[PDB]
């Protein structure tokens, strides 16, 4: 949040003169906020539009600013601990399947929005079931791929 201002003339403005000239749409693209109107921006001064103009070299830097070293990309995660995580999530799936069966059974038994409105406390097992996928996937895929590659590139 940035702003840039300059003072309106020291009155002699009972003439009703505009503070500025206009020959473009270019200055009326933005809506002044209520707060500055409270403190009187168009009554005593005026705003001026901020613009950015980056040069070539700094923007070349600015993208590097997050790159991370090649050393890491080829590295494997430990296979132990990894298996532990797999078993954790798979055993977490059960309770959600059990709950899901009831949640399927009971719907349309009442008015439609009164499904959601009565589901603000207890969780809805669909989402928690779904978002444990995208954790077995992604993880298993990328680990198997990385091992499968580097088994060739070194000897």
């Amino acid at each position: 949040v940035i702003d840039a201002f300059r003072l309106i003339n020291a009155n002699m403005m009972v003439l009703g003169h505009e503070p500025r000239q206009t020959t473009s749409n270019l200055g009326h693209l933005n809506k002044p906020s209520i707060q500055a109107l409270i403190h009187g921006l168009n009554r005593h001064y005026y705003s001026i539009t901020i613009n950015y103009r980056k040069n070539e070299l700094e923007q070349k830097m600015l993208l590097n600013l997050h790159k991370k070293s090649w050393m890491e990309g080829l590295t494997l995660q430990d296979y132990s601990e990894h298996c532990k995580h797999n078993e954790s999530v798979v055993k977490e799936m059960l309770e959600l399947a059990k709950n899901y069966n009831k949640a399927v059974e009971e719907e349309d038994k009442m008015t439609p929005e009164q499904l959601a409105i009565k589901n603000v406390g207890k969780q809805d097992p669909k989402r928690h079931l779904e978002e444990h996928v995208d954790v077995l996937m992604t993880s298993n895929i990328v680990q198997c791929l990385a091992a499968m590659l580097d088994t060739v590139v070194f000897k």
């Binding site: 895929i141 198997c144 791929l145 499968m148 590659l149 088994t151 060739v152």
Partner: peptide, 14 residues
């Protein structure tokens, strides 16, 4: 031979 064709396979899955 797995190390090649299985990589093809998994790339397709993803």
């Amino acid at each position: 031979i797995p190390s090649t064709e299985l990589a093809k396979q998994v790339i397709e899955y993803a």
